[PDB]
Amino acid sequence: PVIPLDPARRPVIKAQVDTQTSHPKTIEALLDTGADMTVIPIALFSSNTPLKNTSVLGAGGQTQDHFKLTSLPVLIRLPFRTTPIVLTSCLVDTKNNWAIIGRDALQQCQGVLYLP
Amino acid sequence: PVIPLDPARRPVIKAQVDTQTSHPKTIEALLDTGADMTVIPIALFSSNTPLKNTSVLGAGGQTQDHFKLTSLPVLIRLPFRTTPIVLTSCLVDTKNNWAIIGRDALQQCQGVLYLP
């Protein structure tokens, strides 16, 4: 689909995310061409998942605390597709503020930006 | 122009920014569907322009200090376009780190995302 861009309405989609640590779950994710990597909430993961420490650069500078990296790939299915996006690793928001489909995932579903 | 999305290559554009406090300058800016509003480096504004306190939420959480809000509109012209984007307000990076074209600007471009 074609998603218009509007400051007042964030471009979000429903996605089914399988972390391979518990059953696949539905999230609402922000479509973000400014994210190098996809971010999913830590709430998706079972209690004893090994997640790696990582740094992430965002608006207010570098954060060491907020994000971990998955050890296993994450599979993501978008509304009308059976074929999953498979990301070798993705960021995990330890604060559960963010679900963001970034350019890693958008690349796999051949998503583009179009400016007339 | 179609802009393919690739985690390894940030989607950037050259944009001429007119803060109306100084001579316009052309900068390289990130095309960012996950940005509510556009961000301009504080280095593009004259020393001692009035700038408003503001809070911004990003990957490291909320910052009170890092960004100001402009007092005057900011006009932005893209390659090969005469008509400016006119932003009532936008964010100002006091750390000179970021130039980000957000959905406020993208809406005026009539830019869209396309997921096949």
């Binding site: 994210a35 960021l91 | 996950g34 940005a35 990003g58």
Partner: peptide, 8 residues
């Protein structure tokens, strides 16, 4: 680091 981008 990966970059991830801005909300008000």
């Amino acid at each position: 680091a990966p970059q991830v981008x801005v909300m008000h």
